[PDB]
Amino acid sequence: LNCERVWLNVTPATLRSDLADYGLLEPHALGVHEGRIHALVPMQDLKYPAHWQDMKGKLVTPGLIDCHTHLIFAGSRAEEFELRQKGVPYAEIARKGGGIISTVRATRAASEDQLFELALPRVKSLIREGVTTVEIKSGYGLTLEDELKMLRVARRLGEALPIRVKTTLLAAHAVPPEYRDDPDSWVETICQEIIPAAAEAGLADAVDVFCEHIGFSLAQTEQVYLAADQYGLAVKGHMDQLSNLGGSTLAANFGALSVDHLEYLDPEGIQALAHRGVVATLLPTAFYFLKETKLPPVVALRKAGVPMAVSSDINPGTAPIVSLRMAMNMACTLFGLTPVEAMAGVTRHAARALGEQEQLGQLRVGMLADFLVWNCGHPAELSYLIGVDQLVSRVVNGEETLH
């Protein structure tokens, strides 16, 4: 079996695009070579070495992927939240510094080393849940130096821990205080300085925008995308979360990897996404914490065949929950997804959302060897039972990482 590492007797939920549901197969032997799945052979065709690990029929799935997080940040909005729960009017909270700006001030003030130290434990929670690839965004700096410093912390995390990290420049998350009366000059700084400096330093894998009434207009959004294109950077966007400005269609035209939130996505946007092969990313935890009532158009997205990814949206003000599995559970409960859709949402579709559809998310020969051996019987459990370590083996790039 011409490869150096082999797992015997694994029951694979391949999650192959061409196989129904979970793509579950009879017991197999999984061999890896040079960080890639080198062979998948039915145990019945075999009858070890000795360093060949026998999983004794335990379930194996591709590593989990959560394609939309803001897990890098400093400060705490817990007290602000408490003031709100107590009845203190939002206006009062705001004038004293509450809101996203609060996170921005804390993050700007925090040193690169501090942000790294603050992010370590957050990533560790995802790791033990089975997350092998995580996407992390900037957007809490709102200055060239602070945006790039966040991207660097993200790069550091990937080097320091056994996990793949995709970085996303999200400088247009909000208009910084210094540009309050000049929203349009902030856009130019992004296009002519921040994106360029980020690209030159190889710090951004993609560019993202918060297209919203309390964010950036469709026009301002188009500006960024144009700049990202010039430096050969992939794009994506935060859209239709609170309102529909037509951002989803625009993103689709630019060949956006994906569009996130989608609470207010319309029929035309859906057609666009389906045609351009854009991934629709559902962020149920944010929907929950914000007590939103307008549900994303899941039914229409399904009818149109638009793949839906599921992610945690870990962030200080909107989704303070560091768990991808909780998000899967909420996608099912709040959005009506099936456990199988949720699973595909954190593997196959999440991979595509990050432009890694050819390298991750499925147990196919030739793709990266990122998989997990669980102690639970069926993959449906991954969306059901939450908060319990259940990994027996976590392999990234062909290597055991659990120890």
Name residues whose C-beta falls within 8 Å of residue 341's C-beta, 6 or more positions apart in sequence: 308, 331
Identify residues 120-179 at the interface with Fe ion (CB under 5 A).
Answer: none
Which residues lie below 8 Å from residue 51, measured CB to CB, with a gap of 6+?
5
Supply the minimum distance, in Å, between the C-beta of residue 3 and Fe ion: 39
- CA torsion through residues 337, 341, 343, 348, sign: negative
> Toward Fe ion, which CB reaches closer, 51 or 291?
291
- Select 259 or 373, whichever has its Cβ closest to Fe ion: 259
* CA–CA dist 47, 49 (Å, integer): 12
User: Pattern of binders to Fe ion over 286-325, x per CB under 5 A?
Assistant: ---------------------------x------------
- Between residues 27 and 320, which has the closer beta carbon with respect to Fe ion? 320
The CB-of-345 to Fe ion minimum distance in angstroms stands at 16
- Give the nearest distance from C-beta 329 to Fe ion in angstroms: 19
Q: Of 332, 334, 333, which Cα lies nearest the Cα of 344? A: 332
Shortest distance, CB of residue 34 to Fe ion, whole angstroms?
Answer: 35
Instruction: Please report how close the Cβ of residue 273 comes to Fe ion at its closest, in angstroms.
Output: 18
Q: Output 240 or 313, the one with its CB closest to Fe ion.
A: 313
Closest separation in Å from C-beta 169 to Fe ion:
13
- With CB atoms as reference, the residue minimizing the distance to Fe ion is 313
**175 to 204: interface string for Fe ion, x by CB under 5 A:** ------------------------------
CB contact set of 48 (below 8 Å; sequence gap of 6+): 6, 8, 54
Q: Cβ of residue 238: shortest distance to Fe ion, in angstroms? A: 6
* Cβ-based neighbours of 61, under 8 Å, separated by 6 or more: 12, 13, 15, 130, 343, 347, 363, 371, 372, 374, 379, 382
CA distance 370 to 101: 38
Q: What's the number of CA atoms in the CB half-sphere (13 Å) around residue 97?
A: 9
Nearer Cβ to Fe ion, position 104 or 396? 104
* Shortest distance in whole angstroms from residue 70 CB to Fe ion: 6
**Least distance in Å: CB of 68 to Fe ion?**
6
Judged by beta carbon, residue 66 or residue 313, the one nearer Fe ion is 313
Size of the residue set binding Fe ion (CB under 5 A) = 1
- Whose Cβ is closer to Fe ion: residue 58's or residue 236's? 236
Least distance from Fe ion to the Cβ atom of residue 261, Å: 7
Site for Fe ion in 73-112 (CB under 5 A): none
The interface with Fe ion within residues 336-395 (CB under 5 A) comprises none
- Closest CB to Fe ion among residues 146, 313: 313
Q: Which is nearer to Fe ion, 270 or 314 (CB)?
A: 314
Closer residue to Fe ion in complex, CB, 228/369: 228
Q: Which residues bind Fe ion (CB under 5 A)?
A: 313
